[PDB]
Amino acid sequence: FRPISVFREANEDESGFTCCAFSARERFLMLGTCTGQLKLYNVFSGQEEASYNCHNSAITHLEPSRDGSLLLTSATWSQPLSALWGMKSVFDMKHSFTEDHYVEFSKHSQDRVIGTKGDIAHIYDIQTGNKLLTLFNPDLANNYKRNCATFNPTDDLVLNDGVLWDVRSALAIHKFDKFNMNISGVFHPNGLEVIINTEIWDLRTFHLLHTVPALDQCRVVFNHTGTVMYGAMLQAMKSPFGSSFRTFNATDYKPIATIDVKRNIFDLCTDTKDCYLAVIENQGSMDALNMDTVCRLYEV
Numbered sequence: 625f626r627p628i629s630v631f632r633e634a635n636e637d638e639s640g641f642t643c644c645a646f647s648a649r650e651r652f653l654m655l656g657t658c659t660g661q662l663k664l665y666n667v668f669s670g671q672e673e674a675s676y677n678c679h680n681s682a683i684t685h686l687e688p689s690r691d692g693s694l695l696l697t698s699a700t701w702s703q704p705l706s707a708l709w710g711m712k713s714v715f716d717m718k719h720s721f722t723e724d725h726y727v728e729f730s731k732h733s734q735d736r737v738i739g740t741k742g743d744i745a746h747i748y749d750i751q752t753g754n755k756l757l758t759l760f761n762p763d764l765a766n767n768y769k770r771n772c773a774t775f776n777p778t779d780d781l782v783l784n785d786g787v788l789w790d791v792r793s794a795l796a797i798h799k800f801d802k803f804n805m806n807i808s809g810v811f812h813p814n815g816l817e818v819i820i821n822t823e824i825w826d827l828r829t830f831h832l833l834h835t836v837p838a839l840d841q842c843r844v845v846f847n848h849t850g851t852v853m854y855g856a857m858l859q860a861m862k863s864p865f866g867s868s869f870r871t872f873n874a875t876d877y878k879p880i881a882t883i884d885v886k887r888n889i890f891d892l893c894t895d896t897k898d899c900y901l902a903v904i905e906n907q908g909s910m911d912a913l914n915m916d917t918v919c920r921l922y923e924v
């Protein structure tokens with residue numbers, strides 16, 4: 625991890641970057657701010673190329689569509705809490721997800737959005753903005769405090785609050801038992817396994833395949849080739865994470881590295897070719913009126 629770029633929010637003495645993702649245009653990073661703006665930076669020169677007022681509160685999350693035409697954003701306490709934005713020609717809101725704190729695109733075909741409202745998953749059509757499904761069963765709920773509903777790689781299944789749902793039938797096919805208070809889980813990009821906090825579960829037998837105590841309270845992200853898994857631990861303008869992330873082999877879940885950048889992390893992502901890792905790193909203290917974040921790009 626060799627840092628090869630670094631920059632802060634132009635003209636802000638308290639740099640307010642909160643989240644980042646690469647755009648479909650390689651040299652250009654998308655970042656959210658603690659005041660609700662979407663910025664586009666040149667990830668090498670640190671030049672601010674563009675700025676949009678998307679929300680009334682800090683952006684917590686953004687996901688561009690692979691084709692470059694759409695962007696999801698989520699916010700902290702503003703209404704709508706999440707939104708879908710067209711980026712062809714003019715930047716503009718297509719749909720708003722009024723009380724979803726988190727949103728994700730479907731994976732195989734990006735024709736759908738899945739949103740989380742506490743313990744409830746909402747699935748929407750991109751083209752209409754209509755809610756196609758509500759996935760919630762109060763008897764099966766685990767009430768995970770950081771629940772983030774997600775689709776599997778083939779879009780036929782949803783993981784919501786540690787419950788596995790068949791999308792076509794809107795049936796709960798399995799509830800994974802609750803073994804932590806916070807982390808709800810992700811699908812492995814291989815589609816054979818789900819990672820719920822420290823437990824790796826088989827998707828056919830629901831067998832426990834690995835116990836990985838190092839993953840406790842970690843938000844997990846794969847690289848685009850699905851060979852490396854990045855974990856950043858939640859800590860118990862307050863960052864969601866601490867000052868370190870860990871990498872694992874996505875195949876056997878062996879630890880590769882533990883990097884302490886010694887600055888609280890707000891977010892991290894990779895380019896689609898997995899050459900770089902962008903990290904939003906806070907300068908100065910937990911106990912500060914504000915944050916002062918920078919974006920650092922590391923060559924992997």
Ligand SMILES: COc1ccc(C2(c3nc(NCCN)c4ccc(N5CCN(C)CC5)cc4n3)CC2)cc1
Nearest residue numbers: 642643682684685686700770843861862864890891
């Ligand atoms: C599975 O565990 C999870 C799941 C989801 C999250 C969320 C998140 N993710 C972030 N970035 C990583 C994903 N984009 C955030 C970044 C900054 C930030 N705060 C908000 C308030 N404000 C005072 C300063 C900025 C809040 C964030 N919340 C809500 C999506 C965190 C941990």
